[PDB]
Every structure is written in C-alpha cells, then in structure tokens.
Amino acid sequence: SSKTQDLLLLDVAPLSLGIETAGGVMTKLIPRNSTIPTKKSEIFSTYADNQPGVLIQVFEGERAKTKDNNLLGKFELSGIPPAPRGVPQIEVTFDVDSNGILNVSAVEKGTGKSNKITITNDKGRLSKEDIEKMVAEAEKFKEEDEKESQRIASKNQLESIAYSLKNTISEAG
C-alpha cells in the first residue's frame, strides 16, 4: 500500500535502477545510495534498424547480468517510424520522486512521441534478503561484474522488441 504511505527510509535507492540492454547487460541510471528525488535522462539508441518501436524493460539491482536483477516492469513504445538504429533518439527518463515512485518516460525525438509508465516501489519487489544479495553479490564479484560491463561494452541500448534469448551453452566468460 505504498504510494502515499511509507516504508522505513526510502530516501535512497536500495538498488540501482536501470534497464536491460541486449545481451543481458544491466544499464544503471539511478545508483544505490543515491538520495531521491532523482530524475535521470539519457538518450538511448535501439540496436536494430527498421524498428517499429522500442521496449524499455526496467531492471533493478547491482549485477552486470540482468538475470540477477529484479524486473520491475516494462513498457513498449510502439509506433516509432521504421528507421536506422540510431535515427530515433529515445530519451529514457527515470524520474524517481521523493516517495520512491519510478516514472520511466521514454521520449522519441524523431517524431515526438512519448510514453511513460508508473512503477512504484510497492509489492514484495525485493525482500530484505534480495537487497543485500544484489549488493553483496556485486561486491563479492567486484572484479568480475565490472569487467563484464567493460568487456561487453554494449550497453545504453534499447531493444525494439523483447529478444528473450540468452542461449547459455557454456554460459559465457
């Protein structure tokens, strides 16, 4: 029931809020320990040409790989003019207000479309265990997870459609 109610100390983001980028790369916009309100806007590009829209899948957590991240929700902005990967500029704004409600707005600068979703910190999104897990795991594999992001490099992307493919055979490395 948390929208005009409280939870103990929602001043800072308990985990980093961001998106998944194609490949299982977690792109962080609002970091943990960052005191809200905080609105972060970045212009992302979709890694696909002839796209009909973009999908913004919101993930929370500290991992480099989105599989250890919490899925908050997603919204599909459909009806974007089919064009090359980086022709439509989609500015994805994570606007987290003081109540900890994450409003993710995606604004497409090419045609001028905009779509936003209201993701509130209300559900058993994380348990107290989950929060500590994601924090601890990223700290635990502090070298590995940062190298993941750095070796993959491909982040700050948007997907036109949910690819939903990993194909983890021998996983990765």
Number of H helices, E strands in the chain: 2, 9
In a domain, 167, yes or no: no
Bridge partner list, 158: 46
In a domain, 36, yes or no: yes
3-class DSSP assignment, residue 144: helix
Experimental method: NMR
Tell me the residue length of the chain.
Answer: 173
Q: What does the DSSP 8-state code read for residue 159?
A: B
In a domain, 118, yes or no: yes
| Distance, CA of 122 to CA of 161 (rounded, Å) | 27
CATH number of the domain residue 70 falls in: 2.60.34.10
Adjacency order of strands within the sheet including 70-78: 25-30, 17-21, 53-60, 70-78
In a domain, 7, yes or no: no
In a domain, 143, yes or no: yes
Question: Exposed/middle/buried for 4, CB within 10 Å: 0-12, 13-18, 19+?
Answer: exposed
Using DSSP bridges, classify how beta strands 157-158 and 38-46 pair: parallel, antiparallel or unpaired. Answer: parallel
Handedness of CA 59, 62, 64, 70 (dihedral sign): negative
In a domain, 1, yes or no: no
Structural domain span for residue 80: 12-158
Q: Which long-range contacts (CB under 8 A, 24 or more apart) does 29-38 make?
A: 29/92, 29/94, 30/94, 30/96, 30/102, 32/62, 32/135, 35/11, 36/10, 36/11, 36/12, 36/96, 36/97, 36/98, 36/100, 37/95, 37/96, 37/97, 37/98, 38/13, 38/94, 38/96
Domain count, the chain: 1
Bridge partner list, 23: none
